[PDB]
Amino acid sequence: QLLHLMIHSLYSNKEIFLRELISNASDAADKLRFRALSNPDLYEGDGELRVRVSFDKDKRTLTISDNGVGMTRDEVIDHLGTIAIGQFGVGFYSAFIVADKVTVRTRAAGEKPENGVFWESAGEGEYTVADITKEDRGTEITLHLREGEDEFLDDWRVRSIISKYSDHIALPVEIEKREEKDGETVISWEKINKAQALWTRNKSEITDEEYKEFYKHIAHDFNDPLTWSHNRVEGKQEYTSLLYIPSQAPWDMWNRDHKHGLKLYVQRVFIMDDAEQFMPNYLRFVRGLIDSSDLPLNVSREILQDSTVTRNLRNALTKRVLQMLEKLAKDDAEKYQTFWQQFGLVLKEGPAEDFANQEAIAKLLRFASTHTDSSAQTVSLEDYVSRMKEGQEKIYYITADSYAAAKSSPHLELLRKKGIEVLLLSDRIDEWMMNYLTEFDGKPFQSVSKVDES
Amino acid sequence: MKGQETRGFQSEVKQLLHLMIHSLYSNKEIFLRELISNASDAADKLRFRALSNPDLYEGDGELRVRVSFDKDKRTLTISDNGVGMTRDEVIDHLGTIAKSGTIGQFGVGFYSAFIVADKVTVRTRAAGEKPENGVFWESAGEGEYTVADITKEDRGTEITLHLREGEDEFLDDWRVRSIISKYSDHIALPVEIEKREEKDGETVISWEKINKAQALWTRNKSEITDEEYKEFYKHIAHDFNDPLTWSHNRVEGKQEYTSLLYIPSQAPWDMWNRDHKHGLKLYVQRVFIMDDAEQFMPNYLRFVRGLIDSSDLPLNVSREILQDSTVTRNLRNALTKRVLQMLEKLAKDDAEKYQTFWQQFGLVLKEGPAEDFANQEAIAKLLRFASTHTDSSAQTVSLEDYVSRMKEGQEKIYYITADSYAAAKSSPHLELLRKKGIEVLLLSDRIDEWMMNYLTEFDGKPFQSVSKVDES
Numbered sequence: 001q002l003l004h005l006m007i008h009s010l011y012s013n014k015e016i017f018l019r020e021l022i023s024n025a026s027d028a029a030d031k032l033r034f035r036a037l038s039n040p041d042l043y044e045g046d047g048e049l050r051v052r053v054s055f056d057k058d059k060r061t062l063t064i065s066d067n068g069v070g071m072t073r074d075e076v077i078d079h080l081g082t083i084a085i086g087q088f089g090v091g092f093y094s095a096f097i098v099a100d101k102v103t104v105r106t107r108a109a110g111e112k113p114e115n116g117v118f119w120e121s122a123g124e125g126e127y128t129v130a131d132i133t134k135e136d137r138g139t140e141i142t143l144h145l146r147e148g149e150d151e152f153l154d155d156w157r158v159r160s161i162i163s164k165y166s167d168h169i170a171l172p173v174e175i176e177k178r179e180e181k182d183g184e185t186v187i188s189w190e191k192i193n194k195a196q197a198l199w200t201r202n203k204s205e206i207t208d209e210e211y212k213e214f215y216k217h218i219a220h221d222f223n224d225p226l227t228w229s230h231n232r233v234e235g236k237q238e239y240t241s242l243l244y245i246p247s248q249a250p251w252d253m254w255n256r257d258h259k260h261g262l263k264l265y266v267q268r269v270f271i272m273d274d275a276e277q278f279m280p281n282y283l284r285f286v287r288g289l290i291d292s293s294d295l296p297l298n299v300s301r302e303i304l305q306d307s308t309v310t311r312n313l314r315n316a317l318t319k320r321v322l323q324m325l326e327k328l329a330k331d332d333a334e335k336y337q338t339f340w341q342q343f344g345l346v347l348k349e350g351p352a353e354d355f356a357n358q359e360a361i362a363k364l365l366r367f368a369s370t371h372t373d374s375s376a377q378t379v380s381l382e383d384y385v386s387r388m389k390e391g392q393e394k395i396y397y398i399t400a401d402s403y404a405a406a407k408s409s410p411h412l413e414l415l416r417k418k419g420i421e422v423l424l425l426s427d428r429i430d431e432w433m434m435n436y437l438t439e440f441d442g443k444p445f446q447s448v449s450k451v452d453e454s
Numbered sequence: 455m456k457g458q459e460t461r462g463f464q465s466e467v468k469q470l471l472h473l474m475i476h477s478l479y480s481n482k483e484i485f486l487r488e489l490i491s492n493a494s495d496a497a498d499k500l501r502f503r504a505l506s507n508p509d510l511y512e513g514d515g516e517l518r519v520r521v522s523f524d525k526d527k528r529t530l531t532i533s534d535n536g537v538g539m540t541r542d543e544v545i546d547h548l549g550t551i552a553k554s555g556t557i558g559q560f561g562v563g564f565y566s567a568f569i570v571a572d573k574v575t576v577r578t579r580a581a582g583e584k585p586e587n588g589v590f591w592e593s594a595g596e597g598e599y600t601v602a603d604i605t606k607e608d609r610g611t612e613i614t615l616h617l618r619e620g621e622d623e624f625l626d627d628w629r630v631r632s633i634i635s636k637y638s639d640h641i642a643l644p645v646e647i648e649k650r651e652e653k654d655g656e657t658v659i660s661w662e663k664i665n666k667a668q669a670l671w672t673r674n675k676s677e678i679t680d681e682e683y684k685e686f687y688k689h690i691a692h693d694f695n696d697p698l699t700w701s702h703n704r705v706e707g708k709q710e711y712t713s714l715l716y717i718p719s720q721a722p723w724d725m726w727n728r729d730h731k732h733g734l735k736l737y738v739q740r741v742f743i744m745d746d747a748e749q750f751m752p753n754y755l756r757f758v759r760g761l762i763d764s765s766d767l768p769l770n771v772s773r774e775i776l777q778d779s780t781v782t783r784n785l786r787n788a789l790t791k792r793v794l795q796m797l798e799k800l801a802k803d804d805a806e807k808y809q810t811f812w813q814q815f816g817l818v819l820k821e822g823p824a825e826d827f828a829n830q831e832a833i834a835k836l837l838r839f840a841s842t843h844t845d846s847s848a849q850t851v852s853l854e855d856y857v858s859r860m861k862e863g864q865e866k867i868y869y870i871t872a873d874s875y876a877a878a879k880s881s882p883h884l885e886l887l888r889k890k891g892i893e894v895l896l897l898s899d900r901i902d903e904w905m906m907n908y909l910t911e912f913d914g915k916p917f918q919s920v921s922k923v924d925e926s
Contacts, residue, residue: 001554002470005562009477011723012694057874083468090476093469097723125468148726154898155875156840156847157813180881222480251479254620341632368628375628402525403627404650 006097014098019165020091021064021141023217025051026171027087028068028139030270032109035069037269037297042110044137052189053162054176057153060145062099066171067138071106073117073131080104080119080127087220092141096123098152101144107134163192167207168214170197197268199242199291203230215244218263218273219287223248226335228288229324233316237309241317243288245324247335249342253284262317263289266297277304278314279321282350282361285343286321315356322360329364340366340377348429352436362440368403368424370416375403379423381440387421394446397423399431412448422448455590455602461545462598464553471556478566482621485570486532487637488563489613491689493519493534494643496611498742500537500581505741505769510581512609520661521634522648525625528617530571534643535610538580541589545601548576548591552599559692568595570624571615579606635664639679640686642669669740671714671763675702687716690735691759695719698807700760701796709784710765715758715793717800721814725757734789735761736776738769749776750786754822755793757815762789787828794832801836801852812838812849820901824908834912839895840875842888847875851895857913859893866918867911869895871903882920894920 010016029049036042051066071079071088079089095102100123107116116134121127134140143152151157159175166173173193179186198206198214215225225244232240243262252259261274268291279286294309304310329336350361362381369379371387384395396415400406406424415422425434438444478484497517503510519534539547547557551564567574572594579588588606593599606612615624623629631647638645645665651658670678670686684696691697697716704712715734724731733746740763751758766781776782801808822833839851843859856867868887872878878896887894897906910916 001466001550004558005474005565006470006477007723008559008562008692008694009474013720014723015720082472090473093473148723151813156849159847160809160813178876179879180876222477248481251482341629375631377628 010094011097015161015165017091017095017098017143018064018161019213019216020087020094022051022162022165022169022173024085024087024091025064025066025068025139025173026169026217027085028066028070029171030068032069034270035109039110044110046136050172050174050191052174052176053158055153055155055158060153062143062145062152062158063140065138065140067136069109070111070134070137070139071117072108072111073115073129075108076104076106076117076119077129080121088139095141095143098145098149099123099143100146103142103144104139105132105134105142106139107137109137111137113137159192164209165213166193168198168210168217169193170195170200197291199230199240199289200268206230211242214242215246215287218289219244219246221246221248221250221287225287226339227324227328229320231320237313237316238293239313240291241288241320243286243317243321243324245321245328245339246285246287247338247342249285249346253346258284260284262287264295264299265289265291266295266299267291267293269297271297271299272301275301275304277307277310278317280314280318280350280354282347282353283318283321285346290317318354319357319360322357322364325364326360337366337378344377345427345429348427348433351433355436358437359440362437365437367397368426370412370422370424375407375424375426384421384423385441385443388443389419392420393443395423395440395443396420396448397425397434397445398448399425399434402426410448411450415448455604458590458600458602460598460600461549462553464550464597466554474565475569478569482566482570483633485563485566485615486624486633488559488566489532490519490634490637490641490645492560492563493532493536493611494641494689496534496536496538497643502742503537503581507582512581514609516644518644518646518661520646520648521630523625523630528619528625530615530617530624530630531612532614533608533610533612535608536581536643538583538610539576539578539589540580540583541587541601541603543580544576544578544589544591548593549599552593552595553597555593555595555597564595567615570618570621571595572618573616575614575616576611577604577606577614578611579609581609583609631664637685638665640670640682640689641665642667671702671712671761672740678702686714687718687759690761691716691718693718693720693722693759697759698811699796699800699804701792703792705788709788711785712763713760713789713792714762715760715789715796717793717796717811718757718759719810719814721757721818725815725818730756732756734759736767736771737761737763738767738771739763739765741769743769743771744773747773747776749773749779749782750789751793752786752790752822752826754819754825755790757818758793790826790829791832794829794836797836798832809838809850816849817899817901820899820905823905830909834909839869839897841896842879842884842894847879847896853912856893856895857915860915861890861892864892865915867895867915868892868918868920869897869906870920871897871906874898882922884920887920 032042046067049067051064053064055062080092092102103120105116105118107113113135114133116132118130118132119127145152162173172191172195174189174191177188177190211228212224224247226247228244230242250259261276262278263273264271264275278290344366347364351358354361365381366377367379368375368377371379398406398410398412403424403426406426412422514535517535521532523530547560551561564574574593574595576591577588585605585607588604590602590604591599617624634645634647644663644667646661646663649660649662670682683700687697688694696719698719700714700716702714731746733748734750735745736743736747750762800811816838819836823830834853837853838849840847840849841851843851870878870882872881875896875898878898884894906917
């Protein structure tokens with residue numbers, strides 16, 4: 001039970017806990033830097049945010065300490081007391097793959113050090129909570145390594161790993177550096193981290209693993225993105241965007257209770273997650289961030305809804321997704337087919353929602369067809385067009401509930417006989433979509449079906 | 455259906471779950487991969503018990519797995535004709551699962567399944583049993599299951615998922631046909647999908663193979679995709695991680711066999727265990743013999759996963775035999791060399807992936823210079839160290855690299871031994887050397903010490919250290 005299912009689902013990469021606590025640190029710092037803008041005292045001492053990693057080979061413990069927003073006993077109770085922010089939970093329990101005891105100690109931002117929180121668990125089922133006095137604010141996680149997990153006690157190996165999960169993080173990730181220097185012990189801290197907000201760096205110098213690690217960072221997805229697009233704009237609109245396209249559709253995609261939007265930053269200051277006013281509905285699947293100069297620091301989820309600057313930004317961002325997608329479509333056909341398998345049904349509600357970009361959208365669509373006796377929705381409108389017979393004016397299509405149903409079940413033999421190709425639309429939404437996508441490249445569509453004799 | 459009896463209760467639940475569902479939403483299409491891999495295995499086991507009793511095939515000797523669905527009923531079936539299940543194997547394996555709702559992989563599959571289906575039904579009959587001993591099984595995957603004895607002429611297992619709503623992609627021909635094609639390109643057992651067709655009033659059913667159906671290692675290197683390889687690894691190693699590289703080789707002549715050997719991206723949680731799980735997968739004349747056959751690799755390479763098809767071994771061969779078998783010894787030696795060539799290559803083609811390998815297995819590989827003198831030289835090149843040459847603790851120093859950087863007139867390879875990279879770096883009395891400017895390997899692994907008592911020289915050059923044992 002405990003063993004198997006995970007030894008294969010999560011234990012795959014037992015380093016997972018590490019690329020989470022660090023991610024949590026990179027977010028706790030963000031929140032703090034946002035509160036402290038208008039409330040300097042929160043920094044109460046050190047304003048140089050960083051996450052520190054260190055180990056005690058003798059005591060067998062790895063520690064990760066950050067000085068960000070820290071937590072409240074309620075915030076803690078909430079994440080670790082699940083059943084009789086989110087990543088912290090995953091990272092915590094995920095740590096047990098490599099640890100038999102994980103201990104947390106945190107004191108909140110702007111709080112009496114006497115209001116610190118202490119939470120511990122030896123894995124199993126019994127935890128330990130306690131109010132305590134924590135001097136420096138932030139969160140500190142101490143792991144007690146199991147036998148055989150001594151790789152997290154080797155300066156080299158540990159350093160190396162940490163790198164793999166922070167080159168994309170802006171928060172400095174410092175590693176302890178003791179050096180036996182005359183008599184006493186000189187304790188230093190050097191940073192492994194390049195420490196610059198990813199979207200801030202020049203595309204030229206960002207590795208693919210960095211873009212990929214960064215996607216998993218903001219989207220909270222174990223999978224890699226299919227493509228992305230990094231763009232910096234100046235002038236009319238001044239902002240920086242970095243948008244992704246997953247490779248697997250999230251479970252909450254087909255729900256009224258979403259998970260969509262872009263991560264919003266203003267003047268490099270974090271504002272909120274899931275700013276849904278930035279992408280139209282037919283692009284719910286896009287993930288990414290936007291860092292605007294033209295938006296106030298005090299923007300409201302409410303403001304963006306009636307915000308013109310936002311609509312303008314949304315329109316611009318919309319076209320980038322469409323370009324990204326077409327570039328993918330020409331650059332790597334195999335991944336686009338993946339895209340289409342995961343999101344084709346979401347993209348089909350675009351012709352009725354976005355007609356300024358209708359042509360573009362239509363080019364990204366794929367269809368099943370008579371041109372191959374398979375149901376592979378591999379056919380593109382342009383392809384269809386290129387194969388039309390001389391004298392053919394219309395793009396023919398049939399609608400049904402099944403590929404099968406629409407294939408040899410209708411009355412398309414006249415067309416078959418004339419050697420004309422017929423799109424075989426068979427998705428629940430196709431019928432509705434065809435009310436808005438009425439012509440492509442100057443050639444109008446037309447269905448086959450019953451009842452019609454002028 | 456006689457004797458329908460419902461069985462309910464057990465008592466366990468927490469942490470684990472939420473953690474898994476998190477990863478079982480990462481890919482709901484996975485349950486399909488499991489069932490297909492399962493039928494693939496429930497097929498090799500039938501072929502093993504085969505020759506010892508050719509009557510188990512009861513007619514159909516063409517093993518396969520059929521996938522089909524019914525949109526109106528919202529069902530998806532994955533029936534194979536492999537070995538099957540005994541009422542007890544059923545209750546034993548399928549019971550535990552149903553009890554913790556809300557061998558081995560036989561669970562991931564059904565678990566992910568329930569995420570997708572609000573009901574899974576399993577009609578089965580183990581090979582070599584009267585059609586009357588057919589076992590039925592079902593469960594809303596809530597807390598209780600139902601069992602009954604049914605009659606199933608057809609041997610094998612017939613799993614059926616009733617799809618939850620919103621899970622319509624699994625009733626979609628195109629859609630379903632891909633995933634299958636995705637999780638079977640690397641499988642030998644044929645994977646067929648139903649091809650229904652109404653012929654003038656009637657409805658004729660046929661089955662078309664979507665699968666290539668060739669044993670991966672039986673195909674030419676050229677023809678195999680880098681992806682088919684990676685997926686084949688996961689299938690036999692049970693490791694969701696891609697491997698770093700591999701080595702496919704078909705040897706003809708004096709030694710008739712084929713070998714596919716991989717080098718995992720990460721050390722499992724049992725590398726340093728006396729309850730291992732280490733060994734290759736043995737095949738004889740293409741027929742599956744056994745798993746984790748540790749008699750084929752030297753202990754210092756226990757990290758290697760892969761398989762082997764011997765043409766010089768009897769369809770008998772047992773662990774006990776391989777152990778005392780000459781043919782085997784010559785193979786372990788042959789494979790050992792191939793692993794080192796592979797490793798040696800990796801170091802050349804991708805200094806970065808090799809640095810991963812080092813990181814993951816460097817310490818296991820350090821036992822080799824003293825447990826295999828015959829190859830001590832090759833092994834010595836593969837090792838990597840943290841020298842003074844760069845102000846870093848990174849273990850990126852080749853011993854060959856070292857032979858280079860050696861002020862003329864120098865003939866010894868110098869090294870320090872410490873408990874930490876820290877100690878080793880300056881804690882000693884290095885100065886004298888630092889002055890004359892000489893490269894010094896900084897060793898900080900517990901095993902290093904043991905190793906330096908046997909690793910005497912490398913490139914004709916002997917090793918000399920800068921010792922210091924200061925304890926009152």
